[PDB]
Amino acid sequence: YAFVNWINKALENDPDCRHVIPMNPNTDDLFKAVGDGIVLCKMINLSVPDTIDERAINKKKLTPFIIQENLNLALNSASAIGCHVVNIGAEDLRAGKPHLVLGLLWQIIKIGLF
Amino acid sequence: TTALVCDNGSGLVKAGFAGDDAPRAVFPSIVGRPRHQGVMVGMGQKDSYVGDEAQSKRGILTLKYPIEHGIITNWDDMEKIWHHTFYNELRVAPEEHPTLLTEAPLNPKANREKMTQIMFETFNVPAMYVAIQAVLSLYASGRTTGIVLDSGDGVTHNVPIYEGYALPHAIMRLDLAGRDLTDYLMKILTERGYSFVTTAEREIVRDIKEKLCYVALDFENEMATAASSSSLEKSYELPDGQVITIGNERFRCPETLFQPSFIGMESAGIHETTYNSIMKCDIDIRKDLYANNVMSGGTTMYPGIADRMQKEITALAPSTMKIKIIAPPERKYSVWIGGSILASLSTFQQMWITKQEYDEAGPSIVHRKC
Amino acid sequence: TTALVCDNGSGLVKAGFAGDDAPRAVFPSIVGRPRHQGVMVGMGQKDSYVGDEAQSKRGILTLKYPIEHGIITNWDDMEKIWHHTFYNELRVAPEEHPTLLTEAPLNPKANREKMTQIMFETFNVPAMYVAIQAVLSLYASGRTTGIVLDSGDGVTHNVPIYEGYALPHAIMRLDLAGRDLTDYLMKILTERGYSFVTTAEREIVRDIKEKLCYVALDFENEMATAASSSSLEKSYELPDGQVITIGNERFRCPETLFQPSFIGMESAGIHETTYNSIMKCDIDIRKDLYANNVMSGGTTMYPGIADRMQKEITALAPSTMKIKIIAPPERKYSVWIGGSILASLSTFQQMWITKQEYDEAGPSIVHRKC
Amino acid sequence: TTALVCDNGSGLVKAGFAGDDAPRAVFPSIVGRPRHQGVMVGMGQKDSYVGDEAQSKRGILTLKYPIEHGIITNWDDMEKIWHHTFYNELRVAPEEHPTLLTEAPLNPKANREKMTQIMFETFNVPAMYVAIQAVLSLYASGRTTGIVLDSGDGVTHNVPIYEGYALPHAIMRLDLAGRDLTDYLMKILTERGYSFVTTAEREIVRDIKEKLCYVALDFENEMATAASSSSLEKSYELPDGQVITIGNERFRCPETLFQPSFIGMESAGIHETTYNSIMKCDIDIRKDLYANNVMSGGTTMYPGIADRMQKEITALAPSTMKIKIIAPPERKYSVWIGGSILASLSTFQQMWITKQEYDEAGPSIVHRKC
Ligand SMILES: Nc1ncnc2c1ncn2[C@@H]1O[C@H](COP(=O)(O)OP(=O)(O)O)[C@@H](O)[C@H]1O
Ligand SMILES: Nc1ncnc2c1ncn2[C@@H]1O[C@H](COP(=O)(O)OP(=O)(O)O)[C@@H](O)[C@H]1O
Ligand SMILES: Nc1ncnc2c1ncn2[C@@H]1O[C@H](COP(=O)(O)OP(=O)(O)O)[C@@H](O)[C@H]1O
Ligand SMILES: [Mg+2]
Ligand SMILES: [Mg+2]
Ligand SMILES: [Mg+2]
């Protein structure tokens, strides 16, 4: 649970990420939505909110069978900060893995802070 | 800052801190690519799989091994492999943490130069180092004198070390550790009404080799036992549901290490390689070499490799003095443990390849700093 | 504003809107045409009948199915049916609402291009898409992995899906879903003395099959029960004022699905078709395909077929792991429900067949976009 | 006496004598069985259809291949075919004429031992020899050095031979010769409103492939020619009376040999297979392997296969030394011709597997004498 608070204090650079990662209540909403790459598009709101909106890129027209459209749409916007783990693709991030998520969060922490 | 030690290998790549007794990176080193058609929107958005992400989906993907016996051909997939090894199993920043690299001996300068530039340009490294796997594996056994047989997945080299000093003229390299063994097994498995062509079954074949194949003591006696009796017949459960049973092709695969005629190469086996390396050393240091045979790598864990090697060396011995084979339980991580021990030392902090020196030295900085 | 989904099946037509869970325009795919002589002035005004008016007046009207096993053999009739659906059934403007059309796999290119051209030049719609009926049946029973046992009115195709990866080489289409069963029932009904030659009598036989015919467990035990006892005897009331009594032909009619040799076909049944389609798939994907069989379509809702092909798969399996088959209550309409569900996708909006792109591309844009 | 050269395979059967240049008994390895109901007495007595009696009545018979990609699964039908070709076709007694049988490389031991036990027990032949088809095809070309590309019905292997000596480690078996091409044509014929599901139409489709399909030089150029113009549209007359016309699915079917991704195969094409075989041989013998490319079998009968694979090899070569292509006219009988030539030699008489030594050794003598 302390990892949730650590990630919150590290990523408050973009408060909009707190709508994906837990917002200090130590829940587990991080894995599935971060595997979809929503935080990557949100992270730009650090300096200017005038960017990819959370409800503009995804308003859950991910139909009750195919929820496969948000993950690649949001992970393709990873030009910011840069997923230095180029081993991983959106195929495996569809579900998410501990080591893979930690490796991507490594870049998130590293470039999120100037 | 704590030092990092990364052990690269053709089959398994290891990483971790310096000082830790347990490894962290436990994953096959494979590359997979999508090859099927997605009729549903949102799929096909990946360039290359790396490791367990392809292991978990080994039905609809191919398998690619960018590491060919310690030779780095395609660096685009190696970038992905190193990114997998470092950030997924360290979570620390190499940009401010020293990382200890491993590299097979008798490696052309281009490979070492390119892996150095990649570290100093793709990454922003403050101080790196490149060490030989055989030398690092000697520190795992707690000794500084004796030969170390490092046999990974496609690399088999013998670097004799005497009181810390190594002999460059007694260093050779054999490209038969685990990959040609897997190829031999998947080729000979077709004699029992089986089909093994695609790489989707390569991981299953490797697992069957790891849990069934064993180094036999006498090959002719094993042939006689398999032909006459049917006692050494063990079955495997295929992931899809069928049941296979192999009794003769179990100990045939590990025998290719000692008998290279199975795969058709003029080089000698693993038992003669260390003897030839010792013969290339001094006559007054063979005493420390016969009694010090430290085993390492991913190959030498067959059930009966130590006794067979001891018998082979004794047959090669002049019947003067005892032969000792060291087979530590952590043979899979002897290189990584030795590297962690060496990097944990206070002396090892003063020859890392710093970036400021590299900026005015150039690409060949690893060549005389390692 | 909203997307339209018109499920064009061989026996039934389903239409509605985007985001709905139950189809609105449901009517059999029958075309009624006068064939007698009208002696009263004012009643012989309509030339052809599309909706249920032909069904209610089948005593002086004929029935003609334009789709024949996923192939539209009569396009003039389907133009009338589409016009009726867009005008009186949906009561919307096709020029302002995209329509989603259904098509079975392994379909001729000219047939596929006709649902493109007849819609773009006649109705002049903004954009459409042509989806796969197997994929649409894989839009109503939520799971990323699973082979679909789709069987509508005249098409029975099995497409294996693993995480979403479709295998075109593993698609096995069978032209035996509902029409062959109905014809089998008609021809076996003549043994007792029930002849069915008039095409207007087809709906009565279809209703009798729907309300009385069912898939049994064992055919030999059913033979024994029918020959010895008469417990499985049910009567049906004909609309014209007569009653029948069939007790042996109830379960014999659906037996053609598993044994198509009754009517004279060399192909295998539906229980073996899925098994063969799985066998030609990969080896590390069969674990997620054995316990996954999407059951849907207008054929597969007989009371006793789910356990039937479950037992058939278990017998055809090496008895390794479990077999479980989902039978969603909406079996018949799963195609339309899946069509609307697909129309409710996010990235599906920017990849409809654009009129501007279609005009500069041509009739072959359907094979390039879909 | 005169040895019998019987080349049994999944497709045609080549049976004859030793020393001749063309076999006498030529018939497909198809077993037909009655499937209709006999209503007239006097014609339902016959149920054994092996030779041409099954081809003529394919519409009332079930044609099945008991051999599956060089693997004999139905030995009961092989016994029937062997008895037929020994009694009615050759009209000789095998009890005094040795029968020369061929076997593909990388074959299971059970298949090799059963074909020996049946001949020694049922046919009680005095002696026979089991030879590799690739080795026998080299004698048909009159050479003793060079890789031979053999491709029959479902087996495609590459066995390079250097100065009589062959390289076992340079042998890989690909299960794509004729059957997967026929299946691919079967699947792609459905895009033109054609239905092909029965086994009786398999022979007609194979004939259509043999007389219309051809190996294209450039695939994208052929796609452009088929899409823009229709100058490659050839019509066919079906036996029942129908007329078909295919222009695009002509050169698409043979392209599966070079691009196995059409049928969903991870293995590479035949053009890269020979190059890969050459790479794993010696570097001093590649000169004799580039300049000696002798193909055998009926697969490479397409009008333009040799030029295409020569272009592929030239593209796959570093453009250092020349490539020579051998396409003898007697490729469909090169295996049989080579077998007859070898069996007619004076040095071939002293390694036949005689009855006494087989009885004293057992079924395993075939693996030691061959
Ligand atoms: N217990 C075992 N017994 C036999 N072979 C093994 C065993 N474990 C791994 N291998 C083989 O060794 C290879 C792995 O080598 P690797 O771990 O890369 O060596 P290194 O540790 O030097 O990098 C694989 O082919 C694997 O099949
Ligand atoms: N309850 C039922 N029991 C048996 N058969 C049925 C039942 N409902 C429909 N059918 C059969 O399904 C056929 C129509 O299928 P259809 O609805 O056109 O499939 P799809 O919706 O996939 O196009 C009819 O011929 C009818 O015989
Ligand atoms: N003129 C031709 N054009 C194209 N393909 C051909 C031609 N003649 C023969 N073939 C193919 O070559 C194959 C020959 O197979 P064959 O050698 O008889 O197999 P086996 O050795 O198992 O009996 C056939 O499957 C056929 O499809
Ligand atoms: Mg190693
Ligand atoms: Mg349908
Ligand atoms: Mg042949």
XYZ file of C-alpha atoms in Angstrom, chain C residues 49-292:
244
model
C -44.838 -8.712 -50.262
C -41.850 -8.280 -47.939
C -43.108 -8.097 -44.357
C -45.415 -10.423 -42.434
C -48.323 -9.789 -44.828
C -46.964 -12.652 -46.941
C -46.724 -14.855 -43.838
C -50.343 -14.202 -42.840
C -51.605 -14.715 -46.402
C -49.432 -17.724 -47.257
C -52.513 -19.644 -48.415
C -52.516 -17.722 -51.703
C -48.870 -16.619 -51.636
C -45.488 -18.259 -52.193
C -42.246 -18.062 -50.224
C -38.839 -17.414 -51.805
C -35.595 -17.132 -49.847
C -33.142 -14.899 -51.759
C -30.153 -15.747 -49.546
C -28.972 -19.302 -50.145
C -26.315 -20.349 -47.641
C -24.923 -16.877 -47.119
C -25.150 -16.063 -50.831
C -27.793 -13.577 -51.994
C -29.061 -15.256 -55.168
C -31.869 -12.691 -55.637
C -30.799 -9.066 -55.273
C -34.051 -7.513 -56.504
C -35.865 -9.096 -53.552
C -33.254 -7.931 -51.024
C -33.439 -4.407 -52.425
C -37.170 -4.483 -51.639
C -36.517 -5.969 -48.185
C -33.866 -3.346 -47.401
C -36.159 -0.546 -48.589
C -38.992 -1.899 -46.433
C -36.714 -2.207 -43.396
C -35.354 1.326 -43.820
C -38.787 2.858 -44.498
C -41.477 1.105 -42.441
C -39.436 -0.951 -39.954
C -36.682 1.442 -38.863
C -38.551 4.583 -40.027
C -35.280 6.531 -40.249
C -33.195 8.210 -42.954
C -30.443 5.917 -44.314
C -28.645 8.938 -45.814
C -28.021 10.313 -42.299
C -27.387 7.097 -40.323
C -24.644 4.538 -41.035
C -25.808 0.942 -41.430
C -23.889 -2.151 -40.302
C -24.214 -5.231 -42.521
C -23.451 -8.877 -41.751
C -21.605 -11.362 -43.956
C -20.395 -14.913 -43.338
C -16.722 -15.765 -43.964
C -15.518 -17.604 -47.069
C -17.974 -15.529 -49.131
C -17.557 -14.628 -52.821
C -16.078 -11.231 -53.609
C -18.910 -10.208 -55.956
C -21.477 -10.932 -53.242
C -19.512 -8.808 -50.744
C -19.151 -5.942 -53.231
C -22.876 -5.996 -53.990
C -23.860 -5.041 -50.430
C -21.398 -2.180 -50.995
C -22.552 -0.877 -54.379
C -26.300 -1.412 -53.934
C -26.046 0.614 -50.723
C -23.737 3.400 -51.954
C -25.481 4.226 -55.253
C -29.124 3.318 -54.557
C -29.607 4.471 -50.951
C -26.594 6.852 -51.017
C -25.619 6.288 -47.381
C -22.747 8.241 -45.771
C -20.693 5.203 -44.712
C -20.952 1.519 -43.833
C -18.897 -1.535 -42.860
C -19.083 -5.256 -43.610
C -18.377 -7.448 -40.577
C -18.033 -11.199 -40.076
C -20.953 -13.115 -38.583
C -18.526 -15.261 -36.586
C -16.934 -12.089 -35.213
C -20.384 -10.651 -34.440
C -21.362 -13.834 -32.586
C -18.049 -13.149 -30.837
C -19.453 -9.757 -29.777
C -22.314 -10.972 -27.547
C -20.737 -13.555 -25.191
C -17.925 -11.663 -23.501
C -14.507 -13.332 -23.633
C -11.318 -12.404 -25.510
C -10.523 -16.071 -26.299
C -12.786 -18.735 -27.772
C -13.876 -20.521 -30.940
C -17.396 -19.691 -32.112
C -19.874 -22.411 -33.098
C -21.903 -20.126 -35.334
C -24.856 -21.772 -37.079
C -27.621 -19.602 -38.522
C -30.131 -20.649 -41.175
C -27.861 -21.988 -43.922
C -24.306 -21.186 -42.814
C -22.313 -22.983 -40.101
C -18.757 -21.645 -39.878
C -16.292 -22.166 -37.026
C -13.540 -19.566 -36.556
C -11.017 -20.118 -33.723
C -10.033 -17.042 -31.703
C -7.162 -16.922 -29.190
C -6.971 -13.616 -27.271
C -8.374 -12.103 -30.456
C -5.992 -13.669 -32.960
C -8.108 -15.136 -35.757
C -6.770 -17.984 -37.874
C -8.021 -17.733 -41.485
C -6.616 -21.184 -42.284
C -8.605 -22.640 -39.360
C -12.015 -21.384 -40.544
C -14.329 -24.297 -41.408
C -17.640 -23.276 -42.990
C -20.496 -25.781 -43.301
C -23.615 -25.142 -45.394
C -25.952 -26.969 -43.020
C -27.610 -24.899 -40.313
C -31.403 -24.798 -40.543
C -32.545 -25.435 -44.104
C -31.158 -28.970 -44.348
C -32.781 -29.823 -41.009
C -36.141 -28.516 -42.234
C -35.897 -30.461 -45.500
C -34.915 -33.592 -43.564
C -37.977 -33.160 -41.346
C -40.252 -32.707 -44.366
C -38.932 -35.792 -46.144
C -39.105 -37.970 -43.020
C -42.646 -36.727 -42.322
C -43.854 -38.481 -45.496
C -43.228 -41.947 -44.015
C -46.224 -41.571 -41.690
C -48.280 -40.008 -44.489
C -47.561 -36.277 -44.175
C -46.558 -34.831 -47.550
C -45.186 -31.274 -47.726
C -44.741 -30.021 -51.293
C -46.075 -26.459 -51.080
C -43.440 -23.859 -50.230
C -46.048 -22.003 -48.156
C -46.059 -25.041 -45.840
C -42.380 -24.476 -44.998
C -43.142 -22.139 -42.085
C -45.425 -24.702 -40.428
C -42.707 -27.368 -40.648
C -40.134 -24.882 -39.345
C -42.357 -24.046 -36.366
C -42.926 -27.758 -35.710
C -39.156 -28.299 -35.699
C -38.643 -25.271 -33.436
C -41.276 -26.400 -30.906
C -40.865 -30.202 -31.025
C -37.459 -31.160 -32.428
C -34.544 -31.358 -30.002
C -31.035 -32.783 -29.837
C -30.938 -36.016 -27.843
C -27.959 -37.482 -25.973
C -27.557 -40.948 -27.510
C -29.151 -41.896 -30.824
C -29.191 -45.672 -30.269
C -30.930 -45.387 -26.895
C -33.433 -43.043 -28.545
C -34.053 -45.663 -31.246
C -34.646 -48.234 -28.505
C -37.031 -45.941 -26.609
C -38.999 -45.013 -29.738
C -39.271 -48.611 -30.967
C -40.189 -50.081 -27.572
C -42.116 -47.272 -25.875
C -44.073 -44.254 -27.131
C -43.342 -41.792 -24.328
C -41.708 -39.139 -26.547
C -44.861 -38.585 -28.618
C -46.063 -34.994 -29.042
C -48.955 -33.750 -31.172
C -49.117 -30.548 -33.215
C -52.210 -28.626 -34.311
C -52.104 -27.565 -37.948
C -53.537 -24.095 -38.688
C -56.069 -25.475 -41.184
C -57.699 -27.726 -38.579
C -55.809 -31.020 -38.310
C -53.592 -32.656 -35.687
C -50.465 -34.745 -36.210
C -48.619 -37.243 -33.993
C -44.830 -37.511 -34.280
C -42.704 -39.330 -31.740
C -39.747 -40.726 -33.660
C -38.991 -37.775 -35.963
C -38.650 -35.225 -33.140
C -35.025 -36.062 -32.295
C -34.048 -37.611 -35.641
C -34.307 -34.226 -37.378
C -31.586 -32.450 -35.312
C -29.352 -35.537 -35.584
C -28.389 -34.395 -39.095
C -26.261 -31.660 -37.497
C -23.820 -34.219 -36.052
C -24.330 -36.832 -38.806
C -24.817 -34.991 -42.124
C -24.730 -38.373 -43.915
C -28.504 -38.674 -43.407
C -29.194 -36.352 -46.351
C -26.182 -37.460 -48.409
C -23.198 -35.273 -47.512
C -19.588 -36.410 -47.176
C -18.726 -33.707 -44.624
C -18.492 -34.212 -40.870
C -20.882 -32.973 -38.203
C -20.762 -29.827 -36.110
C -19.213 -31.690 -33.154
C -16.261 -32.857 -35.267
C -15.917 -29.637 -37.280
C -14.832 -27.677 -34.201
C -12.431 -30.457 -33.197
C -10.787 -30.521 -36.635
C -10.598 -26.719 -36.689
C -8.835 -26.842 -33.314
C -6.453 -29.603 -34.444
C -5.179 -27.430 -37.304
C -4.597 -24.580 -34.829
C -1.513 -24.097 -32.649
C -0.356 -26.270 -29.732
C -0.203 -23.674 -26.926
C -3.644 -22.237 -27.766
C -5.741 -25.424 -27.567
C -5.933 -25.143 -23.770
C -8.000 -21.961 -24.119
C -10.003 -23.413 -27.029
C -11.058 -26.779 -25.574
C -12.985 -25.175 -22.693
C -14.258 -22.362 -24.958
